[PDB]
Amino acid sequence: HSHGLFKKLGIPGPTPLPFLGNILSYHKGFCMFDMECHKKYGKVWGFYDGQQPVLAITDPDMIKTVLVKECYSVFTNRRPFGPVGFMKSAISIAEDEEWKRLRSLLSPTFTSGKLKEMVPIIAQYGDVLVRNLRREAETGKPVTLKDVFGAYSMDVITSTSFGVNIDSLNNPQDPFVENTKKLLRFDFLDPFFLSITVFPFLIPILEVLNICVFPREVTNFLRKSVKRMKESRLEDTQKHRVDFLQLMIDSQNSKETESHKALSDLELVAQSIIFIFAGYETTSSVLSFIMYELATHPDVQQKLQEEIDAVLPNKAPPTYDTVLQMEYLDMVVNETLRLFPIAMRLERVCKKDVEINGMFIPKGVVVMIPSYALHRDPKYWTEPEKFLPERFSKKNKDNIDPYIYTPFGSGPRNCIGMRFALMNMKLALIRVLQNFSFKPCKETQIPLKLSLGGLLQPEKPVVLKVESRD
Numbered sequence: 515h516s517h518g519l520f521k522k523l524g525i526p527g528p529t530p531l532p533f534l535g536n537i538l539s540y541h542k543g544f545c546m547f548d549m550e551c552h553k554k555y556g557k558v559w560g561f562y563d564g565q566q567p568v569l570a571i572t573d574p575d576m577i578k579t580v581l582v583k584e585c586y587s588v589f590t591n592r593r594p595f596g597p598v599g600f601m602k603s604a605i606s607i608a609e610d611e612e613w614k615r616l617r618s619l620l621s622p623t624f625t626s627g628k629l630k631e632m633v634p635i636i637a638q639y640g641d642v643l644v645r646n647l648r649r650e651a652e653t654g655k656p657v658t659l660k661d662v663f664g665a666y667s668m669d670v671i672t673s674t675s676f677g678v679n680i681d682s683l684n685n686p687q688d689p690f691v692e693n694t695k696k697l698l699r700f701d702f703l704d705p706f707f708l709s710i711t712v713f714p715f716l717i718p719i720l721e722v723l724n725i726c727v728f729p730r731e732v733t734n735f736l737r738k739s740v741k742r743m744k745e746s747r748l749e750d751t752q753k754h755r756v757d758f759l760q761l762m763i764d765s766q767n768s769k770e771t772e773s774h775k776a777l778s779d780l781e782l783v784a785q786s787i788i789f790i791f792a793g794y795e796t797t798s799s800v801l802s803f804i805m806y807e808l809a810t811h812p813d814v815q816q817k818l819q820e821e822i823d824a825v826l827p828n829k830a831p832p833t834y835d836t837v838l839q840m841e842y843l844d845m846v847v848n849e850t851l852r853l854f855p856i857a858m859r860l861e862r863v864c865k866k867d868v869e870i871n872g873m874f875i876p877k878g879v880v881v882m883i884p885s886y887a888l889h890r891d892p893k894y895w896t897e898p899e900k901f902l903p904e905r906f907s908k909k910n911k912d913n914i915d916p917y918i919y920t921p922f923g924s925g926p927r928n929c930i931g932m933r934f935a936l937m938n939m940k941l942a943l944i945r946v947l948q949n950f951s952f953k954p955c956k957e958t959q960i961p962l963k964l965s966l967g968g969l970l971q972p973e974k975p976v977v978l979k980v981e982s983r984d
């Protein structure tokens with residue numbers, strides 16, 4: 515049907531099969547498929563997710579035109595991916611004027627001033643993470659990275675979102691923990707999402723049956739939990755709060771909002787759920803990738819510890835202002851996010867026929883930016899498969915195009931939790947690297963292989979040795 519669009523436009527790409535399209539080439543994952551297409555078809559190519567045409571662009575000026583210049587007019591929304599129910603109101607999934615209103619109401623929640631008031635909360639569980647790591651390091655047994663960092667990530671979320679203080683690693687069956695730990699990333703290559711891709715006409719059938727990709731038992735638990743909190747926080751009003759929930763509760767009074775608009779009780783819960791979803795498995799994945807590189811590159815881990823002890827002597831606790839002063843820490847995070855951009859791709863839907871930078875894009879075509887393929891392009895990065903934090907030093911960081919290196923996207927629809935996630939991971943790294951040093955063991959995959967699913971995660975869970983400093 516549509517499997518002749520890119521042929522008439524003179525656009526190269528893999529030859530699509532009927533019904534399926536190009537989904538069969540996903541057997542090596544999204545990342546490998548983008549790398550192969552880039553090497554075989556050049557600067558632009560086209561493929562099909564079932565019937566949906568997708569045009570991949572690599573020109574930085576063209577990427578800027580899609581993500582920045584033509585955002586509000588042409589490339590405003592992301593691709594609909596399945597039955598979302600009321601989670602259609604999540605700012606990541608929202609569309610058109612609905613997204614712009616949510617982006618206006620939610621942007622003051624993520625200012626650097628509001629984050630600084632959240633720093634003492636995040637640093638508290640950095641000390642909790644250390645204590646839980648001291649107990650495991652004294653056993654001498656190797657530590658699974660996803661477990662200790664998923665627990666830290668969960669501790670920060672429950673406290674920064676709703677002011678609920680739990681030690682997730684040691685209280686694993688708290689009803690608040692047991693449900694929030696079910697908010698796992700979406701494997702768009704699993705049997706269900708592949709079937710939704712081949713049968714996109716079945717999505718309206720699943721929506722009327724109230725079938726949601728998010729667990730309905732988990733969403734109901736949070737909708738009732740937020741309701742009880744909003745009622746309870748109306749009594750204990752004199753306690754000044756700083757968590758994400760109260761910033762959204764206060765923003766529900768349009769008379770005190772800079773946008774002169776108000777948040778819905780339905781929308782507020784939707785963002786609270788998507789904030790947990792966006793921060794839980796993502797923060798632990800990046801922190802695990804970082805610690806793998808530091809352990810497999812002891813010179814980088816030592817130099818990072820030397821900078822930390824220089825900025826924070828005598829195991830001084832990390833603060834907001836001191837984390838910004840650590841540049842090699844910023845270079846370790848940035849270089850890891852280059853090798854592992856967990857978003858893999860950036861997508862926008864074309865709302866109307868447009869010709870940008872000398873190329874005609876039809877209406878309804880999903881324009882995709884291959885972040886993983888561009889982060890490892892040997893044209894822009896020398897020895898791209900190597901972990902070299904010096905690429906982001908103050909000397910060479912100016913040679914980095916903001917549209918080739920897009921770990922948090924770009925434009926008005928960039929990651930709204932970029933500064934928070936950067937501050938959260940850095941606070942964890944400082945406390946962890948102050949007290950510990952991470953070494954490989956025989957059960958560590960020294961040549962790290964990545965999973966072939968739809969998630970940018972290690973094939974085998976990263977496991978390392980923890981040894982106490984002094």
Ligand code: HEM
Binds near residue numbers: 617797920929
């Ligand atoms: C280190 C972890 C994270 C990474 C690598 C990351 C990366 C990204 C990327 C690549 C996008 C797509 C932007 C684009 O389309 O241009 C995005 C969107 C988004 N992220 Fe994150 N993100 C992270 C953590 C978080 C956290 C913790 C939150 C919680 C507040 C969050 C909230 C969002 C939201 C709300 C959007 C969509 C905003 C929009 O629709 O305008 N992210 N993120």
Ligand SMILES: CC(C)(C)C(=O)Nc1cc(C(F)(F)F)ccc1-n1ccnc1
Binds near residue numbers: 788
């Ligand atoms: C695995 C990864 C990183 C690709 C992902 O989980 N992305 C994502 C998807 C959705 C949605 F599909 F449900 F719509 C909402 C929010 C986020 N997100 C996470 C961090 N920053 C934004």
